[PDB]
Amino acid sequence: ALLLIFLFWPWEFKAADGESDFIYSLTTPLYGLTFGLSILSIAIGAVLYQKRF
Amino acid sequence: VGGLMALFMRTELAMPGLQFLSNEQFNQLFTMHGTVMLLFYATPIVFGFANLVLPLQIGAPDVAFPRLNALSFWLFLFGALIAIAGFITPGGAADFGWTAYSPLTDAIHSPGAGGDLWIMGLAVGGLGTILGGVNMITTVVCMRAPGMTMFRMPIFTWNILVTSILVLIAFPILTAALFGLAADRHLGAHIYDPANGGVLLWQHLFWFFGHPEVYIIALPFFGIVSEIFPVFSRKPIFGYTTLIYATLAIAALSVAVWAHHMYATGAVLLPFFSFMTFLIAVPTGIKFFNWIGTMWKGQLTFETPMLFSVGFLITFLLGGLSGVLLASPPLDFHVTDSYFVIAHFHYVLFGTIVFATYAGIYFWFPKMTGRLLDERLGKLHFWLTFIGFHTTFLVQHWLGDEGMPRRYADYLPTDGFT
Amino acid sequence: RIKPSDLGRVVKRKGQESFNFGEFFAFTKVCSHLGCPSSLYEQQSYRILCPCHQSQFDALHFAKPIFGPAARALAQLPITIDTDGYLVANGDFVEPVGPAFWERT
Amino acid sequence: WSDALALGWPTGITPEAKLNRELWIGSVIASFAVGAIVWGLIFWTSAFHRKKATDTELPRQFGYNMPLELTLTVIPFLIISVLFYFTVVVQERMMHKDPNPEVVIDVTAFQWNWKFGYQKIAFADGSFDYDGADPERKTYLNFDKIETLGTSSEIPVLVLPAGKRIEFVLNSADVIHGFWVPEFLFKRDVLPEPKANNSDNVFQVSEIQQTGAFVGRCTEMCGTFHAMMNFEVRVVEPNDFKAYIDQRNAGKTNAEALAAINQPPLAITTEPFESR
Amino acid sequence: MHIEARLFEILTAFFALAAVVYAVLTAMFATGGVEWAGTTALVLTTGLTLITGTFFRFVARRLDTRPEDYEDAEISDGAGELGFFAPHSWWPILISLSFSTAAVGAALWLPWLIAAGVAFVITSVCGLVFEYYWGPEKH
Amino acid sequence: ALLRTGKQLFDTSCVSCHGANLQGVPDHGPSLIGVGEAAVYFQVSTGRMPAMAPRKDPIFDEAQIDAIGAYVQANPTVVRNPDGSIATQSLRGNDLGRGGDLFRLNCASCHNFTGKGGALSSGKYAPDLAPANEQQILTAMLTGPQNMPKFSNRQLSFEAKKDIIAYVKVATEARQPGGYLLGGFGPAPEGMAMWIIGMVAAIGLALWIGARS
Amino acid sequence: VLGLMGGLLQINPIWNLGPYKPSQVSAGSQPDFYMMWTEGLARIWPPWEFYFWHHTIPAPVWVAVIMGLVFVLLPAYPFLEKRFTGDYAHHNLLQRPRDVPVRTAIGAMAIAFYMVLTLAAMNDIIALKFHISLNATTWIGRIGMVILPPFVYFITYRWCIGLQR
Amino acid sequence: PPPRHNFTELPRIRSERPAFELHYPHMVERMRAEAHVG
Ligand code: HEA
Ligand code: HEA
C-alpha cells in the first residue's frame, strides 16, 4: 500500500478555497500511516514468534 | 477558609461606605462563603462521621465497597479544589449567588471563567457524594451482626440510611441541571432561555435539589444527639420506634415542599406547599419531646458533649420557631430576601451542624485515638462559641425586619441599621 | 502619538526634555534585555510589552521598565519636522541601543 | 408597646399591610409562648434533675409513654391548622385584583435602575381621565408617554395620589429584580418574561392613607450594583397629583414638575451613591 | 429482607400519592396548567423507590431467614467465611485525578484536554477492574 | 427616518452610558463624537456593546445597527456593495505576500503567526481571529478597540488593508498539509505530544518485550 | 512508532512563519523542550545588574553562570557522593530506589526544579489557555522555583520509608 | 482504639443497648421490668 500510494497519489500543493482540495492534505498522513503500520506489524509478528516458538 | 471569608464580609459590612472591598469582591465573597460552608464542609462531614462509627455500630468488619470509599473521598477533595481555584482567574470566582439563578448565570452576564470551574467542581463532588450514599445503603443492608435486627440498630444508623436515600434522590437532578447550564454557557443551548419557561425551570430544579440537601445535613446530627443524651442521663432513649417513625416521616415529606423558596415569584401553588411545610413542622416537635423525655428524671452530668447537645437544643429551637414563622406566605411576602431569613437559617444550621459536630468530636475522640480531650479547654470553647453566636446572629431579625435585604455590599448612613 | 488629553502625565527623563515633537515620542524598538523587538503597544494602558521574556515599559515615564527581567529604560530618539513638513530625526541617540556589554550600555 | 412585639415591622400605610401586621403579631405571640414552654422544660430538667447527688443506684429505666406520645402528636396538628386557616384568609385578602383600578403604573427594571410609566388614570370621581399608553413600541415591554427614568446621579421618584386604587405591572429587561416598598409590607419579583414563565406580574393596593416619601429597594441578585437600585415614592393629595400630571404633560422633568407644586425636587429618603 | 422492602414501599406509596395529587391540582387551579417539572421529578422519584423496593421484595420472597433477620440468634450462627474485601489500593486516587483532568478540560473549553482526560479515565478504570485478576507474567 | 429611529434606539440604551449629546459621562462612557459608523458597526455586531469583555451575540440586528450608525455619523464609514449590502468578498486582496509581510510587522506581535490568541499584561489578552468576517476585521483595524492601536487610513492604505484581510482569511481556513494541527503554537504542544504519545508507547513496548522483578 | 507520528502529526510548519527579519516579532517563543529550562530561567530571573567604573554586568550573566554550574555539577556526582558517604567498594548489584531515600529525594528535588523551569518557559501559552494573569504566572514560577523542591524532597523521603515499612 | 476489622469478640444482642447489658448484667431484669411505665 505504501508503494502504490507513493506512486499514484496526487501530491502537489493545491491549497486554495476555489476548489477545496482535501486530497493534497492526506498525502503525508497516508505515507506515515502505511510506512509505520507495515514496519510495526512486522515487529509485532517477530515479538510474537519469539514469545511463542 | 469559609469563616475567613465571613469575617471579611462582616468587616466590610460595619461602618457604612466601601472602606476596603469592591462590589464584585463582596459578591464573590458571599458566593464562595456559602458554597464552601454548605458543600465542602457539611455534606462531607456527614460521611466522615458515617465512616467513623457506622460499621462499629452494626457490628461489621468493613464497609461494603472499600475502594469505592476512597474514590469518594478523593473525588470530594479534588472537586472542592477545582471549584475553589477560581480566585486565581483575572475575573475572579463565581459572583452570582450560591443559588445561581436563572438568566444571571449565562454567558452574556457573568462571562468570566470562575463560574465554569464552579459548575464542574460541583459535578465532581456530587458524583463522590452519590457513591458514598450507595456505599452506606449497601453496608447497612448486607453487613450486619448475626443477632442485630433492624429494630435493634442505633438511631444514628437509621438516620444515615435515610440520609443516603435522600442523597440518591437529590444529587443526580443537580448534576443534570448543571450539565444543562454548562451546555448553555459553552454551546448557546437555549435551555434556560426566558423566552421559554427557562427562568422558572431552573428554580424548580434547583430547589427540588436544594431543600432535600438542608435535610441531608440535619438528620445525622439529630442521630448524634440521640446517641449522646442517654449516656449522660443514665437512662434509655425515650420513644425509640417513635423517633424512627419521625425520621421516616421527615424524609418522606422533605421532597414535597421545595417551592416554599418561591413564594414571591407569583408562579407557584401557595396552599399546597404552605400546608406541606406546616405538616413537616410536626415530627421535629415529636423528636424534641422525645429528647426532653430522655433527660427527664435522670442523673445528669454536664461534660463537654452534653453541654454542646444542650446548646444545640436551645439554638435549634429558636431557629425552627423562626422557620415555622417563615412558612406563612403573607409573612414571607415581607420578610423574604432579608436578614430575617439569614438569621433563621444561621440559627438552624449552626445549632445542628456546628454544635452536634463538636459534641460528636468530643464524644468519639477517645474511640478513634485512645486519648481524651481536655475538659477545661472544652468548656471555654463552648462558652465562647455560645456567646459569640448569640451576639452575632440575634439582632439580624430586627435588622431585616426594618428594610435591609440580603447580599447588600453597602448602605447609607441616613438609613437605619448601623 | 499620545492623546492631547493627558500630555501632563509624561515625566521626561533628565536629559531628554526636548526630544518629543508635541505628542510624538519615537522610542527605540530593540529591547534592552536581550534584543528582541518590543512591539506590543497597549494604547489605553500606554504600555510596551516584549513577547520574548515579558518585560514591560511605561511609555509615559520615559519607557522605564516596570516588570520583567529588563533593568534599563529604552533609548529615546529626538525628532522634529523639516521645512517641508515631514518628520525627521533631530540628532542621534544619546546612548547605545540594545543589550549591554562589558564596555557600556 | 406593640412596636416591640412587632420586632421591627414598620407601621403599614395600606389596609393589606395592616392585616399582614396583625397576623404577624399574633403568630409571634404564639411562637414566643411555645418557645417559653420548651425552654422552661429544658431549664427545669437541667437545674433539678441534674441532681446526681452523693447517692445513686440508677434512676429508672422507662422508655415508653404511648398516650402522652399521641397527645403530643395531636396538639401541634391543631395549633398549625388554625394558623393555616388564618394564613389562607389573609393571603387571599392580599391578592384581590379588582377589575377597575384608578391609577396604573408600569414598572420597568433594567440592570441597576428603574423606570416608571403612568399608563392610565381614571378617577371614580370623574375628576381626571388620562390614557398614557404609547405605540412607541413599533416586545413584551410596555412604553408610555409620561415616564420617570432613573440615573446614577438622580434617584427616580414615583408620585402617586392618596386614597385611590393603585395597580403595578412589573417587567424586567435583562435579569430578575425585586420590587420592595417596606411600608407596603409586601414584595414581588420582577421577571424577564412573566407570561412565558407563568408568573402574575400585576398587583394592586386598595389605597394609600398617609402622604409623604418612602423608600424602595431591589430584593434579588442582579449583579454588581444590586445594592444601588433604590427608588422613592411620593404620596401626595389628588389635586396636587392632577396639577403634577398637567404640569408634566407640557414638557417638564421630574424635578421641575415636583418643584412646581411646592415639594423637594430630589429624593429625601435616599441619596445617589457617590462611590458609583 | 422484609423491613427494608417495607420501608421502600412506604416511601413509594407516599411519593405516588403526592405525585398524582400535585399533577391534578396543577392541571386545575394553576396559571398555565400542569407544572411539568415537579410532576416529572415526583413521578421518577416514585420510580426510584419502586425499583428498589421491588428488587428487595423479589430477593426476599425467595430467601430463608438470615441470622441478622432473626431474633433469639446466637453469634455461633454467623460463624464461617465472609466475602472478599480489598486491602490497600492506589487506583482510586488515579481515577479521581483523571476525572479532575477531564472536568477542568470541560470547564475551560479545551477539547484536547477533554480527550486526554477521557483516555486517562478509561486507563485508570481498567487498572482498578483488572487489579485482582491479572496473572503472573508468562515470560 | 434613519436618524430618527437611531436616536430613539440610542436614547433608550446609549445615553445612559455616554450622554445626551454624545459627549461622554466622566465615569461611565467615552466621548463618541469623532467615531464614525464603523465603530458602531464593529462594537455592536461583535456583541461588545451595551455592556455592564469578550465577543457575544448582538442584540440589534442589521437594521437598528445601521440606524444607530447613521445617527452617530450624523453628529470612518462602513464599506458597502453597489446594491447597498455590506461588503463581504470585495474586501479581499490579491497580494498575499504583501498582506503577510504587513501582518507579521503590524499584527502578529499580539495575535500570532497565524491569528491565534495572545497574552497581554495584567488580565487582558488578544483574541483568536477565526470568528471575524472581513467587514469586522476592517472596522477593527479602522477604529482600534481597547488596548489595540488605531490604524488610520492614511498610515495603512485601503489596498494594504484588503491584502491583510485576504492573508488572515487564508491563514485561518487553510488545511494543514502535515497532519494534525497541534494547537497552532510552537514546540510546547509538540513536546507535550512527544511525552504523552511517543514515550508512552515506547515504554509500553519495553514493558511488553522485557521482564520485571 | 516514529514513522506513524512523523506522518500523522505536524511539527514546525515553517511556511506559516516567514523568513527571519530583524523588525518583525510574534508571540511565539519557547525553543524545543530540551532547551526550555534555560528560557524559563531567563524569564523568571530577577533583574540584578552591577555598574562600576565604566563597566556593566547585565542580568543574563546569571543565566549563563547557572547553566555552566549545572553542566559542571552533572558529571561530578559519583565522586561527590563517594566522598560524602565514604563508600569506595565495587558494585555489580543494583539498588532499589526505595532503599536509598536520600538519593531518591535529591533526584526528585532536581526533577521538581527542572519541571518548574520548564513550565515557566510557557508562561504566555499557560496564561492564555488557562485563564491566569501573566504577572501572576511570572511570580508563581519565581516563588515555586525556591519553595517547591524542598517540599518534594521531604515528601519523597517519607514516601520511600513508608514503602520500606 | 479499635483493631483492624474492629472486633475480637461480640456480645449477645438482645436490645439496642448491648454494651450496657454487657457491662451491667445486674440491670437487665430492672431494664425489662420498668420500661413501659411512662
Ligand atoms: C439544616 C438547615 C435547615 C433546617 C433544619 C431548616 C428548617 C425549616 N425551614 Fe429553612 N432554610 C434553610 C435551612 C434550614 N431550614 C436555608 C439554608 C434557607 C435559605 C437558603 C438560601 O436561600 O440561601 C432556608 C429558607 C427557608 C424558607 C424560605 C425563606 C425565604 O427564602 O424567604 C422557608 C419558608 O418556608 C423555610 C422553612 C423551614 C421550616 C418550616 C423548617 C422546619 O424544619 C422547622 C420546624 C421545626 C421546629 C423546631 C418546630 C418546633 C416544634 C415544636 C417544639 C412544636 C412547636 C409548635 C409550633 C410552633 C407549630 N426555610
Ligand atoms: C454551614 C453553613 C454556614 C456556616 C457554618 C456559616 C458561618 C458564618 N456565617 Fe454564613 N452563610 C451561609 C452559610 C454558613 N455560614 C449561607 C448558605 C449564606 C447565604 C449565601 C448566599 O448569600 O449566597 C451565608 C451568608 C452569610 C452572611 C450574609 C452575606 C450577604 O448576604 O451579604 C453573613 C453576614 O452577616 C454571614 C456570617 C457568618 C458568620 C459570622 C459565621 C461564623 O459562624 C463563622 C466564623 C468562623 C470563623 C471566623 C473561622 C475562623 C477563621 C480563622 C481563624 C481564619 C484562619 C484562616 C485560615 C485557616 C485560612 N453568613
Ligand code: HEC
Ligand atoms: C456604561 C456601560 C456602557 C453601555 C451600556 C454602552 N457603552 Fe459604549 N463603552 C463603554 C465603555 C466603558 C467604553 C470604553 C471602551 C471599552 O470599554 O471597550 C465604551 C466604548 C464605546 C465605543 C468605542 C469608543 C472608542 O473610542 O472607539 C463606542 C462606539 C460605544 N461605546 C458606543 C456604544 C453603543 C453603540 C452602545 C449601545 C447602546 C453603548 N456604547 C453602550 C460603556 C458602555
Ligand code: HEC
Ligand atoms: C497587542 C496590541 C494589538 C495589536 C498591535 C493588534 N491587535 Fe487586534 N486586538 C487586540 C486586542 C486587545 C483586541 C480585543 C478588542 C476588544 O476586546 O474589544 C483586538 C481585536 C481584534 C479583532 C477583533 C476580534 C474579534 O473577536 O472580533 C481583530 C479582527 C483584530 N484585532 C485584528 C488585528 C489586525 C488586523 C491587526 C494588525 C493591523 C491587529 N489586530 C493588531 C490587540 C492588538
Ligand code: FES
Ligand atoms: S528580550 Fe525583551 S524581555 Fe527579554
Ligand SMILES: [Cu+2]
Ligand atoms: Cu427550605
Ligand SMILES: [Cu+2]
Ligand atoms: Cu428569592
Ligand SMILES: [Cu+2]
Ligand atoms: Cu437587584
